[PDB]
UniProtKB/Swiss-Prot annotation:
Residues 8-98 form the Acylphosphatase-like domain. The lineage of its organism: Eukaryota, Metazoa, Chordata, Craniata, Vertebrata. Belongs to the acylphosphatase family. Keywords: Acetylation, Hydrolase. Its EC number is 3.6.1.7. Pfam families: Acylphosphatase (PF00708). It comes from Bos taurus (Bovine). It catalyses: an acyl phosphate + H2O = a carboxylate + phosphate + H(+). GO terms for molecular function: acylphosphatase activity. The gene is ACYP1. This is Acylphosphatase-1. It is an enzyme of class 3 (hydrolase). Organ-common type isozyme is found in many different tissues. It comes from the Eukaryota.
Length: 98
């Protein structure tokens, strides 16, 4: 769904994505797009979280997560799961989970 329909989607990013300011840049891009959700480093060398917001903004974020990331990161792969349409947002902000 695109446009203004609200969606939620889970993501996991693989590559050189830890120790490169990925979490800070992701949170800044999410807030800039008006998204809520979260980002966290996993014990497997990856980055994961969820995004919630208007379909069009979430998709730009998905592209950012697949192609750009933080300046020194190198994204090899971005996997998205559990994409669903929602009527209300669950989260109120974009968190960095530690
Ligand atoms: Cl990082």
């Amino acid at each position: 769904a695109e446009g203004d329909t609200l969606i939620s989607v889970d993501y996991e990013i693989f590559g050189k994505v830890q120790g490169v300011f990925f979490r800070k840049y992701t949170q800044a891009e999410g807030k800039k797009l008006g998204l809520v959700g979260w980002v966290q480093n996993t014990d497997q060398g990856t980055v994961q979280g969820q995004l919630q917001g208007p379909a069009s903004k979430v998709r730009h974020m998905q592209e950012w997560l697949e192609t750009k990331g933080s300046p020194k990161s190198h994204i090899d792969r971005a996997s998205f799961h559990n994409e669903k349409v929602i009527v209300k947002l669950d989260y109120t902000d974009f968190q960095i989970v530690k």
